[PDB]
Amino acid sequence: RDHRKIGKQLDLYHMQEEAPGMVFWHNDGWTIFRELEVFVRSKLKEYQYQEVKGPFMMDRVLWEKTGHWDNYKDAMFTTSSENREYCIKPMNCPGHVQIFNQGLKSYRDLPLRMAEFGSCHRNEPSGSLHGLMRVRGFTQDDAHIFCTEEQIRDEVNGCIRLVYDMYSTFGFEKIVVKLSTRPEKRIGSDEMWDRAEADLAVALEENNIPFEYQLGEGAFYGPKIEFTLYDCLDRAWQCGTVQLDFSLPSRLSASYVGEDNERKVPVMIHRAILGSMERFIGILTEEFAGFFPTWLAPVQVVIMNITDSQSEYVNELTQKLSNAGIRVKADLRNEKIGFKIREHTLRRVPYMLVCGDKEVESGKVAVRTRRGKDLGSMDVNEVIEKLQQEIRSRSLKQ
């Protein structure tokens, strides 16, 4: 099953030729995107990250300084104002360094873990575009960690732990790890590259992760661990990545006062856990075939009456569920109950609540699922409590 067809069927998003690789998120697709942001934030809280927002564009001069212009030009969108050229950002790192550079920093501030849901644009050749997996405007669940050389091992380990921790929520069985080494166009000395490649290889082996080399595929600023996930046709897509950069901070004048009083340049680790939100949603859509786990489902519950005798009761339950934090809709249409059920089933709504007279009298609801399971009559507080529990726990199934 193809996420593109499922995305159309569940009204998640669309694209058009007046904006190639530019996603229009419809309400239900945007709901998923927003839930993933909530999830990422909850994890960024426990793993102790700041969250910032950098400028959408910056002067071409700044991108020249980083090496992005010489080592990354063709991918960049540019725009002008008052005789000055700007690049629309393809990466968030330089903005993060600019924020780091505001206010004197010391060893007391490190590791400084700076996250952003960073909207990037890259002028990917139009012939390489594919659904939500490869677009031109995407959002990374990005962060840069500023740390000392002594903190590299612990911070790289932390990023690797975060990847497997987050990925366990989604239950991915195939996670293939690559270590992408020095590309033909790069910055930093060969000696820097030897150290950075070794630090990553050693981090993988310490974490017991089998990996394959991807020779020459590292970033221009540093080598990359890549966590690869697979779509329905077993095509490989880079999602998670952890990268070690001994070059950009220096190019952007980042420094801090060390514990030993020597002013030094911080090491920077770049990482994304999901990758891009768009690509990750494309992957999830295929992984679940549109049957999103309840916490991610655009609409979690639909409540239906059989006739207008139960309209008032349906409205009452809908408000009760909505106040409980459940994404719930009432379907009060003048249509046969079996017509309504089929619509919501095809829409992959996890739970459907049917109210006839028997339900009104008893204060219960007849519960069924999008897999055709019939859970029979249930008391209303118990469905609320079970739903809340499965949402809060982000349960992979139920």
Binding positions for Zn ion, rule: CB under 5 A: 93, 270
- For residue 162, which amino acid is it? L
Determine contact, residues 143/187, Cβ cutoff 8 Å.
Answer: no
Residue in 142, 231, 245, 331 annotated catalytic: 142
Q: How far is the CB of 95 from ligand 1B3 (least distance, A)?
A: 11
Q: How far is residue 148's CA from residue 142's CA, in Å, rounded to a whole number?
A: 20
Positions in 129-158 near a copy of itself (CB under 8 A)? 136-137
Span from 61-69, 128-136, 184-192, 194-202 in contact with ligand 1B3 (CB under 6 A): 128-136
DSSP one-letter string for 150-173 = GGHHHHHHHHHHHHHHHHHHHT-S
Q: What is the enclosing helix (H) or strand (E) of 366?
A: strand 364-369
Q: How far is residue 304's CA from residue 306's CA, in Å, rounded to a whole number?
A: 7
Q: How far is residue 314's CA from residue 298's CA, in Å, rounded to a whole number?
A: 20
Q: How far is the CB of 3 from ligand 1B3 (least distance, A)?
A: 11
Q: Tell me whether residue 121 is one of the annotated catalytic residues.
A: no
Span from 47-55, 191-199, 241-249, 337-345 in contact with a copy of itself (CB under 8 A): 47-55
Cis amide prior to 94 (ω within 30 degrees): no
* DSSP single-letter state for residue 261: S
2: annotated binding-site residue?
A: no
**Orientation angle between helical segments 311-323 and 380-392, nearest 10 degrees:** 30
Q: Tell me whether residue 41 is one of the annotated catalytic residues.
A: no
Nearer to ligand 1B3, 93 or 366 (CB): 93
Positions in 77-96 near ligand 1B3 (CB under 6 A)? 91, 93
Span from 56-64, 166-174, 227-235, 387-395 in contact with a copy of itself (CB under 8 A): 56-64
Q: Which two tokens stand for residue 331?
A: 């379907």
The Cβ-side half-sphere exposure at 304, using a 13 Å CA radius, reads: 23
Taking the mean position of all CA atoms in its chain, how far away is CA 173?
Answer: 18
Q: How far is the CB of 148 from ligand 1B3 (least distance, A)?
A: 19
Sign of the Cα pseudo-torsion (320, 322, 327, 333, in order): positive
Picked from a copy of itself, Zn ion, ligand 1B3, none, the partner binding residue 272 (CB below 5 to 8 A depending on kind) is ligand 1B3
Q: Does 56 bind a copy of itself (CB under 8 A)?
A: yes
243: annotated binding-site residue?
A: yes
Q: How far is the CB of 190 from Zn ion (least distance, A)?
A: 22
Span from 59-67, 134-142, 148-156, 323-331 in contact with ligand 1B3 (CB under 6 A): 134-142
Enumerate binding residues for ligand 1B3 (CB under 6 A): 91, 93, 122, 124, 132-135, 138, 140, 142, 219, 224, 241, 243, 270-272, 275-276, 278-279
Q: List the catalytic residues.
A: 93, 122, 140, 142, 144, 224, 270
